[PDB]
């Protein structure tokens, strides 16, 4: 576990990121402060970062808290394996709101919108924060491995 190229360029500005270690697939992983998701977004594009990746939900354990993931890459004419940067920020069921990058780069107009209903964590910096996948009629937050999956007539044993 150590810093990264971003930190290599950024330490001279005396604002350091959360220095986490390598991933599992064969690349690295980083982390940013939850409430400070805007500083990283405004500095990365200044470094040249304008493409996201891996817009997915998460859970800590069966009976655990929530989280979110953001990988990042660039696009250039002459490119050779752009740097694999990953962020995985954890958040609690209470006050589940993390900033969004919708207002810095417009590559995630609907990406974060699915997590506005999917798991029990919403996000500001995104207008129209309402359900899309699940019917608006439904209210619950599915896909949590500890969430009570509706034990109605249409899931459990109906004979």
């Amino acid at each position: 576990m150590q810093q990264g190229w971003l930190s290599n360029w950024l330490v001279k500005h005396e604002v350091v990121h959360r220095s986490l270690g390598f991933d599992h697939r064969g690349i690295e992983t980083l982390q940013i402060k939850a409430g400070d998701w805007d500083s990283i977004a405004v500095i990365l594009y200044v470094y040249g970062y304008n493409y996201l990746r891996s817009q997915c939900a998460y859970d800590v354990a069966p009976g655990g808290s929530l989280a979110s993931v953001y990988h990042l890459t660039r696009i250039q004419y002459g490119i050779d394996n752009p740097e694999e940067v990953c962020i995985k920020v954890f958040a609690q069921k209470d006050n589940p709101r993390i900033p969004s990058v919708f207002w810095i780069w417009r590559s995630a107009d609907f990406q974060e919108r699915e997590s506005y209903d999917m798991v029990g964590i919403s996000y500001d910096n995104h207008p129209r924060l309402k359900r899309i996948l699940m019917p608006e009629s439904w209210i619950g937050w599915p896909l949590r491995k500890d969430y009570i999956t509706p034990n109605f007539y249409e899931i459990q044993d109906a004979h």
Partner: peptide, 10 residues
Amino acid sequence: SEYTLRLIGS
């Protein structure tokens, strides 16, 4: 809301 409508139809 149709939430109550499913609550009835069930």
